[PDB]
Amino acid sequence: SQQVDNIKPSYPLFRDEEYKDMLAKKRDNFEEKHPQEKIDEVFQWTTTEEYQELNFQREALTVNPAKACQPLGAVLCALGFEKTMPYVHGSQGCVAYFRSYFNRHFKEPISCVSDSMTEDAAVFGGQQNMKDGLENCKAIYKPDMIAVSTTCMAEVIGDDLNAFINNSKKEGHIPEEFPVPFAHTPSFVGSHTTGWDNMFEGIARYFTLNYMEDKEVGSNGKINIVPGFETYLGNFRVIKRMMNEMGVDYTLLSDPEEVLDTPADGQFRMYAGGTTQDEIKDAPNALNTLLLQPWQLTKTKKFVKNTWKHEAPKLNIPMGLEWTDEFLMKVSEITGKPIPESLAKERGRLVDMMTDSHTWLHGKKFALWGDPDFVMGMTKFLLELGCEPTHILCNNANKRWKKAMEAILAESPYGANSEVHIGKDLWHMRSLVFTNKPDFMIGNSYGKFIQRDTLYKGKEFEVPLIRIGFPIFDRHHLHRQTTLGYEGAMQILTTLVNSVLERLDEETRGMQTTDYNYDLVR
Amino acid sequence: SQQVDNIKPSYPLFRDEEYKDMLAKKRDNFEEKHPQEKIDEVFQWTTTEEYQELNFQREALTVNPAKACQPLGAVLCALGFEKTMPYVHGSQGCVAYFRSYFNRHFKEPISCVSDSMTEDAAVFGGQQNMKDGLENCKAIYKPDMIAVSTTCMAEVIGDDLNAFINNSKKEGHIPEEFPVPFAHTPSFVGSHTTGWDNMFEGIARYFTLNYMEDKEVGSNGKINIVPGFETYLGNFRVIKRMMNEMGVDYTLLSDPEEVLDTPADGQFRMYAGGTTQDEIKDAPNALNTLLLQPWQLTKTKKFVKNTWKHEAPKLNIPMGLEWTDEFLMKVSEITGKPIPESLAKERGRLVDMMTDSHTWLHGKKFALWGDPDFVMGMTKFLLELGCEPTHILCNNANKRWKKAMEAILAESPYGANSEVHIGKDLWHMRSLVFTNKPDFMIGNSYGKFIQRDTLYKGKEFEVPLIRIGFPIFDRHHLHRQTTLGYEGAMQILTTLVNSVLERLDEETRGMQTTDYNYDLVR
Amino acid sequence: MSRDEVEALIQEVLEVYPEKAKKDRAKHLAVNDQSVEQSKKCITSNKKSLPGVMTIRGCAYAGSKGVVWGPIKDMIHISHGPVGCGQYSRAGRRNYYIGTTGVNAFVTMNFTSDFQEKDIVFGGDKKLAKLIDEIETLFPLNKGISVQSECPIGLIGDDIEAVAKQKSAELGKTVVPVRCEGFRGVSQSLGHHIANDAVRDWVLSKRDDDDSFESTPYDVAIIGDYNIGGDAWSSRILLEEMGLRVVAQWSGDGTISEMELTPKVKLNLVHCYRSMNYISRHMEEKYGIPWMEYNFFGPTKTIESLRKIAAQFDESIQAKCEEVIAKYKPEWEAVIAKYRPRLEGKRVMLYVGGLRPRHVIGAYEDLGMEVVGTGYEFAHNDDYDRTIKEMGNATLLYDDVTGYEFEEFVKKVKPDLIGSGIKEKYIFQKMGIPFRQMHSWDYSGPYHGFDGFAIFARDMDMTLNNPCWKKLQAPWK
Amino acid sequence: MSRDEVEALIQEVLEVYPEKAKKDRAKHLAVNDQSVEQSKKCITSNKKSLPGVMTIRGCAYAGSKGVVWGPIKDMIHISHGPVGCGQYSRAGRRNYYIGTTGVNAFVTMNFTSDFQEKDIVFGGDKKLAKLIDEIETLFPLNKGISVQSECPIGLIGDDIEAVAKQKSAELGKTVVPVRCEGFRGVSQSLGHHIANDAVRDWVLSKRDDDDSFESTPYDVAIIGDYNIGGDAWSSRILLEEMGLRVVAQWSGDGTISEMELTPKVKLNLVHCYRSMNYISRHMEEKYGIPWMEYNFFGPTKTIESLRKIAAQFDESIQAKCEEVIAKYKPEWEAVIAKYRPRLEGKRVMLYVGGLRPRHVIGAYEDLGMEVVGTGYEFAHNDDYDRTIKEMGNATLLYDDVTGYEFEEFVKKVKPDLIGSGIKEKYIFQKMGIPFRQMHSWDYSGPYHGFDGFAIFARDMDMTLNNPCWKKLQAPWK
Ligand code: ICS
Ligand code: ICS
Ligand SMILES: [Mg+2]
Ligand SMILES: [Mg+2]
Ligand SMILES: [Mg+2]
Ligand SMILES: [Mg+2]
Ligand SMILES: [Mg+2]
């Protein structure tokens, strides 16, 4: 039944006694369900250190990974160029999914085409796809550039993107001087981050490899900033704000911030803002190039040293206090621009918030996951806050990263009880939070199922999720936040200390039980 | 018992069996407590319609008010002028509390002096205190201005502030030219808001009342902006941001934002930023004067019309979409500066967010309280979002404001089941949320105890608190947020909808019970 | 808009295309005419998508793993290949179920073999075999496993069938190989077929000899309701109230045992013809189980469907049917009395997958709303045949519509509401057009049955009449 | 820092003052000598505050309402007058209790008469009477009422005493008028006294005739413990394990019944001398109940105190005292084992109210920390007398310290830690000095007793050795 004044959706509709009566008969008669007792027994077993040892013995099965596949990053990279259509050479299934995944994080449109390779193209490659694909895309969606990446199919059959593209030009499917950067993005190597790096280097190479003879390091008096895979709008904004406050002439290379945040003012705009073709063409004439997320820009780093002759600084991601300082001092060194007082104050303000909130953050234990650079930067910041990052996991990281993390951990007394896990997944992470229970998880929306599992064991065992990273599907507009710089540190600290105080208020709301500590002031 | 590797503060220390037994024995032997059954029966009765009728029949008892006393406001106003010391002429116990109350909201130092009136002043008056206090305060703390307000003591005995100040100057206790604006701030009239307006009007008078001869409206090209009592830093910041983007020359009259947010960089700065005495002196030359919170700026309005000859425009507080629109358009009209595309875009992003989130917000019932301008502004925005503001209370508002609120509610279908309460308190509010349960409260930290009470009736009866307003003492750094303009509307929307989704996750996290609706994507 | 004007719209949109694409697309756009019984006369379907036009369609993996298998709550469904596909489809679809996830049900989890390069270069058959062992150790209460092949499995020539057979006999548990590689077919549609076939060949025969199940005259199965937002439960309650015993649901909240019991029922009740007609026919041929199509969107369709269902049985059922109707009569009447005035005369364009573009039209019409255009990602001509009498005259139809086309149609048609997918949602909101997700139900529903109707009507109204839509224009322009 | 160096500091700081103030303050600043027995030879106290100097002190309303009466959980305490005082004092003091707030307990609520102009002009006696009827209707399970007078009550000539006696006779409940107007006295101190005198006059003699209560030889009461963070609970435990029966706690988690039963006890244990010396003397004179001052901050003081308490009783209790001491021996040793190395040699400046500036010195010292400066807001010379032998030679002592004086001292003295109030806390963090709240315990605690010492130690370490303090310098400066 529904009453029209009080219409119930799935929850709490299905909680009505009749629904509940029904689902129980369904179970009993036809579903052949294991005994609840059996269920509880197994559940209790999945929480043990015994299960944990089996879990960590896995060599072949992956469960609940914290990573995606290269072309997801190829696409995000491409969206950052002016009037550029991302184009994924291969099967259309992949592109349906790329678009939806980004749609749900950003609650925005995501524009991406496929050349719809099918069974035919296995026998005889995807040359016809690339020809008509390019011509169709160019006529219909009117891009100024098409940035080509690949699905795993086209990787496996061995489509040569380079020749395929040139032939399309040769037979008039598209103009001679129409930009079609390309990159090979195999899903079975690395991750979405690796795809960002490849697409980026693809586009840098396309525009500058053969134009170096007339270039001169420092000639345009700027610095190039390269963001990598970035899904907070406020991270693009905060870098641009800081450089403008310093009077630093800058070029952001791959800047999706406009196109990820168009106004709802009556018109759809498939394209908005982004790096211009001039900026990428002019990019070698910069003083130098900063890599904001160095662990995911291996290839880009190499290209930029070897071709452009920019000796890119070893900067960690500008997260927390020390590393934002090192970023700003390095920019200053290079640009000769002094760091203004405005920035000294913002920094001072962060420190004041650190002093204000330390009693609550101190000794607080965290499980953490996400992308390598993010994870490393969050870990740094937690150490600065007097938090224990007990369980640090990065699904898409190598051993070099693990060692550099163990180094950061070894430098802080708050890092004594931590362990860095690489190539593990959220099913591993689940066991960890049962056997060595932290206060909170920092992660993406996937961590909510871990939070549901801890609760079934008991409220005393529940680990609340603090959502920071990618993707975040079950809250709205978190993608407008910042995690880089002093601003990002402010926001992070706010979220952590208020997460602590929220949980405490939850445990002390029990009237005449725990509410002796339900304090008005904290 | 403490184990050193698991040291428990009060919670959870006193949940130990040893402690619980001790507390039971304490109760049973000596406390002569009413039986629990009796306690529960009365509790139950307090949730009823019957009890609500009784509760609303109160003429004399006030319980859990949602306002403070005037001089609290005058202190805040005065902090907003350059190198200015708040001085409350009256009992010193008053100022200890002003300081602490503000210490706990902003997590900042709050500078304020008293002249410590005692028994003796009760007959002969506080002339002696004014003399010595002015002289001591100037020598010790070196302000360039002393802003004088009153405690209730001094109002009741009738100290003439004007004469007392003149005699302090006549006997050489302070220089004759040293600025000492003053106001009578009686705690038994209106509230802290009234105090702000009294203080502001006193400072304006001091600097301009006898200096109108050489003044021409518009001659300095600026517009004046008078914020009223504001405890969100972002609100000062967003007004100035917007005026700068618009290329508008403005003077913010009472700017406490530097001094309520000094950096932790090795040194304490008692004074920081603020409106200059030249600004307040020059203020009659502005084109006009905008009052950001008009319901609390009665006296200032009269003064500015009558003395300065500014026709202060009839503007609601610039909260939500429509009223931000009206503000910016009125600024444009007054200044001749067009509204730039940057603000148009920011507008469109807000509308975008609205479209994206409207499904979670539709028909969500809110209780709220706070100051009259804020409450009116939040009510407007909730209607713009398709939310029902069922319980609207403003302890410190008059019959004129209530009628104007009913006018706003009547224009919107979402306001058809709403009721406005004036001069009521949070014990009244407790009844409302039992008898006609909303989904959430919007309010200050005092709301948490209402939330406590609702849970005890049961989890299905619990009404969570959304902390927006003043004061907020049990969460940190929320004072840095914004409620004004598009930026404030964005921040609010996010909090509201994430409040809905956080609650839903909790209600559906129960495995095999309600977690059929524990969706990854929302 | 007249037929003439609509055909001029279609011509003007087609101008943008290069010649080859233009010739193809002209065949996938039509103006409805109710005289025509042969939909092939006006429109082609179920063809490959043009390169580079931004189709909305997905792949066979989606149709198989995403749609048919992955809902089945007590089996573990491996995404065999690189990590992408399993991660983008994890919990993306609200196929509701009851279970203890990680223990006895696995729907919202992501099991993959997560192929690295050496898995590509030397094959993954042994990774897969070791994988199935680790499942058994770590998840002993699973009642069966499926292998959902991603693109590279066919291309490097892995024999998953060989592993399925070994591990199945070794464990005493069904292991189903499924060749749903993304390159096969042209859409999700072939995935449905491959998956229906996997059921047939690897599961549905399990209880052919076993006669232990106690039947009744009134046993039925719900074929093709995937329980989006509790949709099947809303349906299910109405059939049980009507006298019937619902032995199985495929595949919403469904189980392996439920599937293996389905050949024992009397009647198959097909909601989604498109995805599950294949198995419904095999069950008629092989078991002599009849099947009928039904529709549970709105009270008109629900009342009709309930009556047609009950007619397949005796009097006692038909009587019990008239009581389900009588009992909900006041409920749906109230829903209409409140909501229909707020929606009367409003126009709607739809675009969904294989059923909803036709199925939900009566539900709109019960609220006085008009569907002025509809279409499918991947339907076949038997779908468009069923659509002809469901839509008005001179209404626009579109098959495998392109990003560009759908926008141009919307600009010219100027609908009050659009009901489509997550890739479409944020486009049309920006244009100021109310939008309801007609796959995810915008995280609402159920929309099936009488209880779903209240919700659907509430939803259309909350979005269509939202104040947010009056406010897109800055007042100083 | 020599004695001459600190004398010089004081002179330096005194330079800022006009001559009048300069002469006053000079009498309120001292360098400790431990031969001195009579404090008054070097510091004056309990005087008027100077106008305009930014004293930290509060009022007699704070001392009565906020400090003494508020904690009493089963009574309703009316802030009588305008609305400020009760608002600012609502729940700012962490006087912990067990109750159902709003039903049987009322501590964190703000009851007020909320004076308007007409209440000033025409008196609030009729308002007050009406209010007390309303309390009886809306809060029936209250066990009595206090009326906490605010500044105006005494200046307009209201007779609350008259209303109290009338209401008390008519309700059969005690109604206590308290003349704690904040103009009275100079500070919180007189508030305490006014409040102790209201206890005596209006509550304490209520069971003089009644000897229904069963006394034992081991009955005690804790006097002057307001249960900040569970402090009195941390203390109660040790006394019950030592074999005493604690009949009463004044006033943290206190009830009117236990106040009324305190005349039946054998000994009064006074934690806070300043606030409740008055009532302890009254109960000595009137009931012949002995009383003794005690100290439960840190193990050295807790151990001394237990034995000193145990000696007032027989040998059964003196045995149990050694068992308690033995049981907690390894626990406090672990705390020192861990924390003293992180804190050895660190220097502290305190500033608090009437007790904690001397009382907590032992707890620091057990962690190898030296208190190099200490002061009180509103203490009398008897307090300073008891401070002499706690603080070491050549240490700084200050009374009613001014905002200016404390800043300047901290800059010159450069402490490693500062322990003070909320108004001080955010000044010294920005200067770079670790700061602990010595009133609210920084939302932590308890600090009393063995269990308290672990938390105290943890907190001193967490704050003094925190990473935040190394970062205040921008590294490009
Ligand atoms: S299975 Fe099919 S696309 Fe019939 S692949 Fe798709 S849950 Fe659609 S129109 Mo998403 S043929 Fe179901 C469908 Fe309809 S996933 Fe759902 S909404 S009724
Ligand atoms: S009562 Fe006094 S100021 Fe003895 S008014 Fe004050 S809860 Fe202090 S040093 Mo706040 S004489 Fe108690 C006190 Fe000491 S409120 Fe607490 S900390 S031990
Ligand atoms: Mg249920
Ligand atoms: Mg959006
Ligand atoms: Mg603190
Ligand atoms: Mg601060
Ligand atoms: Mg502190």
Side-chain angles (χ1 to χ4, degrees), chain A residues 218-444:
Chain A
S219 53
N220 73 13
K222 297 170 199 178
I223 60 176
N224 302 136
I225 335 276
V226 180
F229 188 105
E230 181 54 75
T231 57
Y232 286 112
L233 298 175
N235 288 338
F236 295 124
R237 293 172 184 174
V238 75
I239 311 302
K240 287 200 266 159
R241 193 264 288 166
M242 292 195 292
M243 293 301 96
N244 281 348
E245 272 176 295
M246 293 183 54
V248 162
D249 212 10
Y250 75 89
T251 303
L252 192 60
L253 296 181
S254 182
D255 178 8
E257 81 112 307
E258 294 306 302
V259 70
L260 293 166
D261 197 39
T262 64
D265 65 346
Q267 97 182 49
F268 174 51
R269 307 161 173 70
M270 177 175 285
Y271 311 115
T275 308
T276 69
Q277 279 180 41
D278 293 345
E279 294 180 294
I280 178 59
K281 285 165 174 150
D282 197 43
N285 301 125
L287 290 157
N288 206 345
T289 302
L290 277 77
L291 301 175
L292 297 184
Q293 310 200 249
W295 288 94
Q296 63 157 85
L297 300 164
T298 282
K299 193 165 182 157
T300 293
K301 192 186 198 208
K302 278 167 140 61
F303 174 83
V304 156
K305 281 180 310 191
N306 295 343
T307 307
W308 288 4
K309 309 295 170 176
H310 302 173
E311 181 50 281
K314 6 290 159 61
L315 289 169
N316 299 113
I317 188 173
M319 279 185 67
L321 187 51
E322 176 174 315
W323 291 351
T324 298
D325 295 344
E326 290 171 9
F327 179 86
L328 289 171
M329 283 173 324
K330 185 61 68 168
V331 177
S332 177
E333 165 177 16
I334 294 167
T335 63
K337 288 304 209 297
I339 305 165
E341 285 303 305
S342 58
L343 277 171
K345 215 159 59 168
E346 189 195 4
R347 180 187 186 276
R349 288 166 163 170
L350 168 57
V351 173
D352 184 85
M353 297 161 65
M354 285 169 69
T355 67
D356 290 347
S357 307
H358 77 271
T359 59
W360 286 123
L361 291 178
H362 174 275
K364 283 304 189 310
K365 282 143 50 50
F366 294 97
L368 204 224
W369 72 85
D371 283 345
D373 292 285
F374 164 82
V375 158
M376 171 171 280
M378 182 62 67
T379 280
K380 190 40 155 45
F381 188 39
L382 286 169
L383 290 175
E384 298 177 320
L385 290 171
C387 301
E388 277 194 66
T390 58
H391 302 305
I392 297 153
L393 170 158
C394 187
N395 202 161
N396 54 334
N398 59 43
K399 293 202 285 248
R400 193 183 328 106
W401 178 89
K402 180 171 163 187
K403 292 180 165 84
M405 276 287 300
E406 279 163 3
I408 289 164
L409 284 176
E411 200 184 348
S412 179
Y414 291 93
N417 302 128
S418 304
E419 260 176 62
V420 185
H421 292 286
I422 66 167
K424 304 311 190 212
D425 59 36
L426 299 190
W427 196 257
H428 293 123
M429 181 57 86
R430 177 181 172 289
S431 273
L432 292 183
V433 308
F434 282 113
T435 59
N436 185 7
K437 163 195 188 325
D439 307 293
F440 302 89
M441 284 165 316
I442 307 175
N444 54 24

Side-chain angles (χ1 to χ4, degrees), chain B residues 92-93 116-119, chain D residues 45-49 55-64 180-194 274 278 353 377-380 400:
Chain B
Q92 79 196 16
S116 315
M117 305 197 346
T118 76
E119 265 121 342
Chain D
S45 65
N46 191 33
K47 302 294 171 192
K48 291 189 302 296
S49 288
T55 176
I56 288 158
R57 281 172 163 177
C59 66
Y61 163 94
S64 182
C180 56
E181 292 96 319
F183 62 84
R184 303 190 187 283
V186 308
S187 80
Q188 290 95 315
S189 184
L190 197 62
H192 300 155
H193 202 163
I194 295 157
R274 177 64 284 132
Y278 319 102
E377 295 174 24
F378 55 74
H380 300 195
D400 192 27

Side-chain angles (χ1 to χ4, degrees), chain B residues 369-424:
Chain B
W369 68 91
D371 281 348
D373 284 290
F374 165 81
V375 154
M376 178 178 274
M378 186 63 66
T379 297
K380 183 67 175 67
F381 191 34
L382 288 166
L383 295 162
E384 297 180 319
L385 292 167
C387 292
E388 277 201 73
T390 51
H391 301 303
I392 305 161
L393 176 148
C394 170
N395 196 172
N396 56 334
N398 61 25
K399 306 184 54 43
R400 200 180 322 101
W401 174 92
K402 172 171 142 117
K403 180 199 172 88
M405 276 281 302
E406 287 158 354
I408 292 159
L409 288 162
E411 292 173 19
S412 175
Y414 295 88
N417 298 126
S418 67
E419 171 66 51
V420 183
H421 309 271
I422 47 166
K424 306 301 176 159

Side-chain angles (χ1 to χ4, degrees), chain A residues 1-2 4-5 7-10 13-14 18-19 22-23 25-26 30-34 36 38-39 42-43 45-46 51 54-55 57-69 72 85 87 91-93 96-101 103-104 107-109 111-120 122 128-129 132-133 135-137 139-142 152-153 156-157 187-190 262-268 270 426-427 446 449 452-453 456, chain C residues 16-18 20-21 48-55 57-59 61-62 73-74 82-85 87-90 92 96 98 100-104 109-117 120 127 130-131 134-135 137-141 143 151-152 155-156 183-187 207 213 229-230 233-234 236-237 240 245-247 249 253 255 257-258 261 331 334-335 338-339 402-404 407 422-423 426-427 430-431 445-446 451 454-455 458 472:
Chain A
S1 293
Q2 299 279 24
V4 79
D5 48 304
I7 284 162
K8 313 173 220 71
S10 83
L13 182 56
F14 292 129
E18 63 178 14
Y19 280 104
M22 186 178 77
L23 301 150
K25 287 141 51 209
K26 179 187 187 295
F30 311 127
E31 291 191 354
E32 293 172 10
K33 209 161 149 184
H34 298 277
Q36 191 66 77
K38 181 63 39 169
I39 296 178
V42 174
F43 172 74
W45 177 63
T46 67
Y51 187 96
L54 299 176
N55 191 17
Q57 286 171 69
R58 281 188 281 127
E59 276 165 9
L61 167 65
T62 297
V63 187
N64 300 345
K67 58 169 183 194
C69 72
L72 188 84
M85 180 71 71
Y87 175 121
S91 339
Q92 76 194 5
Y97 281 145
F98 304 155
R99 291 176 69 203
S100 303
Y101 207 68
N103 293 311
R104 290 158 178 174
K107 309 238 192 275
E108 285 288 276
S111 289
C112 194
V113 303
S114 179
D115 62 9
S116 289
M117 286 172 44
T118 77
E119 203 159 335
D120 311 81
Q128 202 59 44
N129 296 253
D132 299 319
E135 183 181 352
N136 281 337
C137 182
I140 302 160
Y141 295 120
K142 303 213 199 308
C152 47
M153 180 207 180
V156 171
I157 76 196
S187 63
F188 49 83
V189 183
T262 64
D265 65 346
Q267 97 182 49
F268 174 51
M270 177 175 285
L426 299 190
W427 196 257
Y446 291 118
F449 311 105
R452 167 202 72 215
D453 293 347
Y456 188 67
Chain C
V16 80
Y17 284 123
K20 183 181 177 173
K48 52 189 135 61
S49 305
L50 287 159
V53 305
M54 211 180 297
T55 181
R57 287 174 166 181
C59 69
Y61 163 98
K73 60 171 175 193
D74 57 4
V83 71
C85 323
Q87 192 65 344
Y88 314 120
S89 56
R90 191 194 171 179
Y96 270 11
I98 312 280
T100 306
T101 302
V103 175
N104 81 310
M109 306 186 41
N110 167 19
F111 295 70
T112 174
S113 58
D114 179 36
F115 273 27
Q116 300 311 294
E117 183 150 33
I120 295 299
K127 185 172 205 182
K130 178 66 167 79
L131 190 162
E134 287 164 357
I135 281 181
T137 294
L138 289 174
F139 299 93
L141 295 188
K143 289 185 76 194
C151 277
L155 298 170
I156 72 186
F183 60 78
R184 310 185 185 292
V186 301
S187 65
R207 300 186 192 205
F213 170 73
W233 291 331
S234 330
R236 167 190 191 105
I237 186 162
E240 291 181 356
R245 188 155 90 115
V246 198
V247 157
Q249 315 186 170
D253 183 50
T255 61
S257 65
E258 279 178 287
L261 291 172
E331 310 197 27
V335 168
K338 184 173 177 169
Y339 285 121
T402 77
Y404 175 87
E407 207 200 300
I422 188 68
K423 297 197 299 306
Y426 299 118
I427 308 170
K430 282 189 190 291
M431 299 185 47
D451 279 353
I455 304 174
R458 181 204 64 179
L472 272 85

Side-chain angles (χ1 to χ4, degrees), chain C residues 60-206:
Chain C
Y61 163 98
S64 173
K65 183 274 173 177
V67 172
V68 170
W69 281 103
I72 301 156
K73 60 171 175 193
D74 57 4
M75 300 183 61
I76 284 172
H77 319 278
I78 309 150
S79 306
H80 194 38
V83 71
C85 323
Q87 192 65 344
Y88 314 120
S89 56
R90 191 194 171 179
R93 180 169 184 242
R94 309 176 50 245
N95 36 231
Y96 270 11
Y97 65 102
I98 312 280
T100 306
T101 302
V103 175
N104 81 310
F106 314 93
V107 169
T108 51
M109 306 186 41
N110 167 19
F111 295 70
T112 174
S113 58
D114 179 36
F115 273 27
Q116 300 311 294
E117 183 150 33
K118 59 178 199 150
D119 310 308
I120 295 299
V121 177
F122 305 108
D125 278 339
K126 302 177 190 158
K127 185 172 205 182
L128 178 55
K130 178 66 167 79
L131 190 162
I132 293 161
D133 287 349
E134 287 164 357
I135 281 181
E136 277 312 300
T137 294
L138 289 174
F139 299 93
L141 295 188
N142 80 75
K143 289 185 76 194
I145 299 165
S146 78
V147 188
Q148 304 289 319
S149 290
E150 292 171 4
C151 277
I153 304 306
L155 298 170
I156 72 186
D158 285 355
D159 185 312
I160 67 168
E161 286 78 11
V163 172
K165 316 198 197 318
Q166 156 212 358
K167 306 309 303 196
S168 182
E170 191 195 310
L171 301 173
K173 223 115 83 155
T174 297
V175 187
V176 176
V178 190
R179 293 287 187 171
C180 48
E181 297 100 315
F183 60 78
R184 310 185 185 292
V186 301
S187 65
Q188 300 101 302
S189 180
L190 189 69
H192 302 169
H193 201 162
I194 296 164
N196 279 49
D197 284 348
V199 181
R200 183 188 65 197
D201 295 340
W202 301 94
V203 175
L204 186 64
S205 286
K206 192 157 196 254

Side-chain angles (χ1 to χ4, degrees), chain A residues 359, chain D residues 425 442-443:
Chain A
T359 59
Chain D
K425 168 161 162 155
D442 234 338
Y443 323 107

Side-chain angles (χ1 to χ4, degrees), chain A residues 103 106-109 260-262 264 477 479-480, chain B residues 349 351-357, chain C residues 426 429-430:
Chain A
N103 293 311
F106 291 110
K107 309 238 192 275
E108 285 288 276
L260 293 166
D261 197 39
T262 64
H477 311 304
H479 68 278
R480 314 182 70 66
Chain B
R349 296 163 159 174
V351 185
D352 191 71
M353 292 170 61
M354 282 165 68
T355 68
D356 295 344
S357 302
Chain C
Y426 299 118
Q429 289 184 359
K430 282 189 190 291

